[PDB]
Design a protein around this nucleic acid. Structure first.
Lengths: 26, 143
DNA sequence: ACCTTATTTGCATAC
DNA sequence: TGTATGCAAATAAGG
């Protein structure tokens, strides 16, 4: 199992934009 | 209280900033140096990349955009118109010694951190934070 | 002061 | 060569 060792940005603007696009098309 | 319009403003500005950066002949690394020399807001190529790809948080992106837009408007307007610590490099030999200390005891006292920093010719604060981050990593990878 | 949890941020390097 | 990204140093915010 390859586990990510370091810290990550948990929620990006990219994901938020995809998620708005998921909710609008709803 | 989320605002859809703010996300659009960031998406648009990201796309137009990249467009206009390129048209001005600036690499991502160039933007980051220009903002240091000119404004004191030194920033890495990494951070410009993340900003243009929208791979920062909403709060971090919102805080950077005005600093980026200011740079861009000046660079395009030429008609006669304190600082973060450098990221300390920890070489593999030093990391391996610290790792061994961590496996011995993952929470050295303040006196023990002092001994370590002296042993390894490092600043007490860097060794202190190394152990803090290493304890956090241990929680992250064994979640 | 100095830990915690949380997040920004840049080396170093792979494409 | 520039760009994207894994690992993590540095910082933010609370106790």
């Amino acid at each position: 199992p390859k586990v990510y060792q370091g810290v990550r940005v948990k929620i990006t603007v990219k994901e938020l934009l995809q998620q708005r696009r998921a909710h609008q098309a709803a | 209280g989320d605002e859809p319009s703010d996300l659009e403003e960031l998406e648009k500005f990201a796309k137009t900033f990249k467009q206009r950066r390129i048209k001005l002949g600036f690499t991502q690394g160039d933007v980051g140096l220009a903002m240091g020399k000119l404004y004191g807001n030194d920033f890495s190529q990494t951070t410009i990349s993340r900003f243009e790809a929208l791979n920062l948080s909403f709060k971090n992106m919102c805080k950077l955009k005005p600093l980026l837009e200011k740079w861009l408007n000046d660079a395009e307007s030429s008609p006669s118109d304190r600082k973060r610590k450098k990221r300390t490099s920890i070489e593999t030999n030093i990391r391996l010694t610290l790792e061994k200390r961590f496996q011995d005891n993952p929470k050295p006292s303040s006196e023990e951190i002092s001994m370590i920093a002296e042993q390894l010719s490092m600043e007490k604060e860097v060794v202190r934070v190394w152990f803090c981050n290493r304890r956090q990593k241990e929680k992250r990878i064994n979640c």
